[PDB]
Amino acid sequence: IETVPVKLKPGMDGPKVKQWPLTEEKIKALVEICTEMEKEGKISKIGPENPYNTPVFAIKKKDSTKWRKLVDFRELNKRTQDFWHPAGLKKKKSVTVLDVGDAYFSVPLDEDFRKYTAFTIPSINNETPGIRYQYNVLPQGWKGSPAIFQSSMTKILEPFRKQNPDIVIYQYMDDLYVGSDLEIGQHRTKIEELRQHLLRWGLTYELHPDKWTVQPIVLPEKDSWTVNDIQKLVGKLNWASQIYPGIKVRQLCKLLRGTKALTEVIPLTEEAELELAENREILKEPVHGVYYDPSKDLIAEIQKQGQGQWTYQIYQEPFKNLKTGKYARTNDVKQLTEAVQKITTESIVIWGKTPKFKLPIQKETWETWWTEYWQATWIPEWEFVNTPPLVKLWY
Amino acid sequence: PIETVPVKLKPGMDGPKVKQWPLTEEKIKALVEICTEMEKEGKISKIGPENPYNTPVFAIKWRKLVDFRELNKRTQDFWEVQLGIPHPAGLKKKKSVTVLDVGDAYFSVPLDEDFRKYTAFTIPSINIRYQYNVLPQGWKGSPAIFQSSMTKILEPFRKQNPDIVIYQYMDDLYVGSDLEIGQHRTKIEELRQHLLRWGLTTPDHQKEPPFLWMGYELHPDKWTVQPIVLPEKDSWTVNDIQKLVGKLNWASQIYPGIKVRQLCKLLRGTKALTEVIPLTEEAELELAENREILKEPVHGVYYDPSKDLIAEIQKQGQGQWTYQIYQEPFKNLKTGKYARMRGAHTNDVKQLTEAVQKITTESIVIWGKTPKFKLPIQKETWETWWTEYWQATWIPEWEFVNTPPLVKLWYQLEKEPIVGAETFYVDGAANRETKLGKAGYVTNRGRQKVVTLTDTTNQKTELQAIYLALQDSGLEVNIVTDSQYALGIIQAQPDQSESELVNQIIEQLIKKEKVYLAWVPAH
Ligand SMILES: CC(C)c1nc(COC(N)=O)n(Cc2ccncc2)c1Sc1cc(Cl)cc(Cl)c1
Known part of the structure; x- marks a missing residue:
């Protein structure tokens, strides 16, 4: 067969990415899978004149006792000549x-390019050099395939x-x-x-697109309001005023006048009941003028809500969400990982792009366990936040 | 006997051309004698006017030396060893x-025929140009x-x-x-x-x-660290002190006893790298207590895949955590410490959790599996903080060990305002030139107090107001603040901080029975 000639964006070089450590188990599985793939010529051991490297992981898709080899070409993809x-x-x-x-797997990969798909099967405690390979065909997970x-x-x-x-x-x-x-x-x-x-x-299992929505912000309905209750309302409304500037809180703050006990019930005035209701009307719909913009990055933030509850927002301009939702019940990690997948999937569906995730977890923790419950074939970009969501009760 | 491996120079680089260092007769002759035997063995070969590049040669003493640094600066990069x-x-x-x-x-390995040309060197007229046919000595890619x-x-x-x-x-x-x-x-x-x-x-x-290996000493039944020594100096510059602290930190990883606080104080306000600094008496002591700690080499046993990996953590000083990884009681495989400070505000459970993470990653890298942990924290404790914490954490199967100090939650802020408890609306602000630090409060019961300060920011005054609130209230309090700074800090529920007010407040919060803290926008 003849090969399609690939190129790196004129001025680029291959990826030299660090391979995160794996358990013996994941190493063993990886090595089986690879020589067989070698046996079939898909990949063939490579030499030390190849300086490049791409991370590889071992996932076992459930309902089978069979491991699957996932390769993290994220970096390669970032530098393969812009394909159209x-x-x-x-x-x-x-x-x-x-x-x-x-x-x-049935497509010869351009000779001069295979060198960039080099990857490494690690060794426990580095007592062995590390098993090196390269692809001779079209590799899974690579934007160029x-x-x-x-x-x-x-x-x-x-x-x-x-x-x-x-x-x-x-x-x-x-x-x-x-x-x-x-x-x-x-x-x-x-x-x-x-x-x-x-x-x-x-x-x-199926996906139900038409049955989604950029959920509304809801203010509480109450027969009686307390000092605290109102203090919270005003707070949540203040936040919400950056998205919707027509929101008003003058009348309500009027109630917060004086110094009453936090648990004390404050009757709502007519001016206060009207404002709240106008505020309720503004919020009944998602903020106007919020459209997807291809030149921008899709960003997704997740907040742990306890009770196996996790809320998330997809947005490009902060406080201009294109979509919101919740994932629900196992541990924090498994849940966090299932959520990233669910979210990435919708994202690919709606905009055909994966979003950059802001994960509420310590990095080292994620890297160690994300492969445990990952069943997708792609890997989104992600970063880790260490700052408490001050908007966990508002968002 | 093995397929030569293709090699090339970096993007658009040329071979070496550094003229030959005209050497002496005693020298030329020696190399002439050395090249002859390597030649008759393959390793090299004469070339002629043909080849353009030139690597200078030297004859260390009667040993041949080819200065390849200038050909290794122009050769592709190789998969690190x-x-x-x-x-x-x-x-x-x-x-x-x-x-x-x-x-x-x-010399028993062949060099790529299309790269060779670049390994050309020149032997002066006894009174001869060559090239390698084998991984030369001194070649980046060999x-x-x-x-x-x-x-x-x-x-x-x-x-x-x-x-x-x-x-x-x-x-x-x-x-x-x-x-x-x-x-x-x-x-x-x-x-x-x-x-x-x-x-x-x-x-x-x-x-x-013992096999000497990368700073280690390998014996049959165990491994030891080569002795770690610190410099002996009467005059210490800032440069000396920095490298010293450098070595110490590094070595404090296996020698948990090591301290650097007093030696690093010495770095304060330093005007020059060569500036010499008198060692403090608290600094001299510390330097001595480290020399000693370092006299007893760290050592451990080898791995027994037949037994289980157990890791034990301990709360040492402040933010300091020690840990041992063993298979049999006190027969350590490895020992270490974890003391990072991931952010300004934190507490003991998060820290114990981070330490747990570190050891896991290290285990996985060293033995390919995670260990069974014995931690100084009750199930009750870790579970309350776990489902209360905003980040997702992964706890591993672990066994408790009542070996003090125990890790515990020093407090938990209420989730709902307290009924019947005095409500304190606290506040504070100042003068930018210099403080009109007037921090105080007002309550639903009429009690009121204002306190003036000196040398303090604007947020410090908000924190003060809460402190004043906390110190002046019963065991149950409701505090309303407009400070995001204060709120953020406190909401995190840290049990210690580099601040004194934040710390005072924390002990105050610990003393209380109930504490609800509320934020309201700053008008
Ligand atoms: C077979 C090899 C992998 C090996 N395994 C053990 C683990 O030790 C045992 N007991 O097998 N040892 C250490 C040793 C030292 C002295 N006598 C016997 C062995 C060694 S030798 C060794 C030597 C160097 Cl320079 C570096 C390293 Cl990483 C290991």
């Missing part, structure tokens, strides 16, 4: 996703959509998003068939 | 360990290629014999097994045999233990 999103699935009623990484297979990807999708643009399918890297606004049981059935429409070329 | 430390305590203890010599196997080549050779053997451990370091091969001397010996010979078949003749001087 169907709204409607975010609309469909039930969506499905499939893994088409395999397809790539979809872009190069594109030519043959659509060229294999026609026999289901040339004159069948009823249902919808989107492809994000190794991902296949099949959205069909059809019947529940009559869903699995239309995809289980695409599962057999690509297989003719080699590669041998 | 020392990937990882490693720690002596991860090493599995075998019954027998043999060490094999490689040595001359140095160690990497050597080890790698060596790895490839062993790969097979390591296969047909997994129960054997082989550590390749420099010019030696440390092979350990758990077989019986009869079997061990035989295997070795096979290895010797295999090694021969690739041109790695193994001499049939026997280096014995």
Whole structure:
């Protein structure tokens, strides 16, 4: 076969990323998987003249006792020559996703480029050099594998959509998003068939988009208000006034006049009940003028709410959320990890991009356990925050 | 006997051309004699007017020396050799360990034919140009290629014999097994045999233990640290003191007793790197107490994959935590300390949790598994803070150990205002030139108080107001503040801070039975 010539953005060089430590277990699994992949020529041990390196991990997708090898090409992707999103699935009623990484394994990778896909199987306590490899084909998790297979990807999708643009399918890297606004049981059935429409070329639970929303901010409803109650209302409303400047709190603060006990009930005045109600009206809808902007980064913040409860916001301009939601019940970590996935998925669905996460956890903790419950095929960018969410009761 | 490995120069670099250092006759002749034997062995070869570059040569004393630094500045980069430390305590203890010599196997590896041209050197007229055909000595890419080549050779053997451990370091091969001397010996010979078949003749001087290795001393049943010594000086500059503190911190990792506070005070207000500083008496003591602590070398046993890994943590000083990793009571594999301070405001449980994390990562790196922890913290305690803390934490299976001091929650702020408790609306502000530090409060019951200050910020006055509130109230209080600074600080529920007011407040908060703190926007 002939290879598609790839290049690094003119002025770039390969990645030299550190490989986080793994348990013996993950090492053992990794080494099995690799020589077999070697046996098949996908990868072939490499030498020391190759200075590059990309992290690799070992995940075991549940409901099987079989390990899968995940490679972190995030960095590679950031530097592969700039290579050159169907709204409607975010609309469909039930969506499905499939893994088409395999397809790539049948495509020779450009000679001069394999060198950049070098990765290392680590050794416990570094008593062994470390098992080095490189890809000879199209690697899973690399932005360049979809872009190069594109030519043959659509060229294999026609026999289901040339004159069948009823249902919808989107492809994000190794991902296949099949959205069909059809019947529940009559869903699995239309995809289980695409599962057999690509297989003719080699590669041998649902999502509910339309049922999402950038949830509203809600003020409490009460028969009686206390000093504290009002102090909190004003607080939450103040915050909310940066998103919606029409919000007013003069009348309420009037109530906070004097120095009464925190637990004391303060009757609401007519001027105060009116303001609250106008405030309730402003908030009934998501702030105007908030649209997605491709030139911007999608950012997601998560806050732990206790009781296996985790709230999150996706936004590009702080306090201009494009979406909000909650994940719910196991431990903090497993939950935090499942949440990042759920969130990343919707993100890929709505905007076809993964967001940069701000994770409320110590870094070393995450790095050690995230692979424990990771089932996705991609890895989003993430950073770790150490500052308490002062807006954990407002957001 | 092994596929030469392709090599190239950095992006658009040229070979060396540094003129030849005209040497003397006694010198020229010696090299002439050395090149002759290496030539008749392959290692080098004459070249001629052809080749352009030139690396100068030297004849150390009668030993050939090629200054390659200027060709290593123009050669590609190689996959680093020392990937990882490693720690002596991860090493599995075998019954027998043999060490094999490689040595001359140095010139025993071929250099890429298209790179060679660049290894050209010149031998002056006795009264001769060459080039290497083998990993020259002094070439940036030779160690990497050597080890790698060596790895490839062993790969097979390591296969047909997994129960054997082989550590390749420099010019030696440390092979350990758990077989019986009869079997061990035989295997070795096979290895010797295999090694021969690739041109790695193994001499049939026997280096014995302790093996000196990267600051370590390896004995049969244990490992020790090479003695750590500090400089002997009458006059200490700022430079000296900084490097000293440097070494100390580093060494404090295994010598938890080490302190640097008094020696680092010495760095205060220092005008110059050469400025000499009289050592404080509290600094002299500390320097002496460290010299001593460092007289008793750190040591531990080797790894027994047959037993379990147990880690024990202890609350030493302030922010200081010691820990031991053992398999059998007090028979330490490794010991250390953890004392980082991740942020300005914190408390003991978060810190114990961080320490727990560190040891886990280290374990995973050293032994490939996490250990069983014995921690000085009740289940009740860690569980209350866990589900109360804003970050996601991962606790491992652990066993309690009532060995004081115990880690505990010194307090918890109420979640709802306290009914019937006096409500204090506190406040404070000042003068920017210099303080009109008037901090005080007013309560629903009419009690009121204002206190003036000196030399304090604007937020300090907010903190004061809360302190005043706290100190002047019953055991149960409600405090309303407009300070985000104060709120933030306190809401975190730290049990200690580098501040004195924050600290005073904390002890106050600890004394109380109930405390609800509320924030209201600053009008
Ligand atoms: C077979 C190899 C992997 C090995 N395993 C043990 C672990 O020790 C035991 N007991 O096997 N030892 C130490 C040793 C020292 C003296 N006598 C015997 C062994 C060694 S030798 C060694 C030598 C150096 Cl320079 C560096 C390292 Cl990391 C190890």
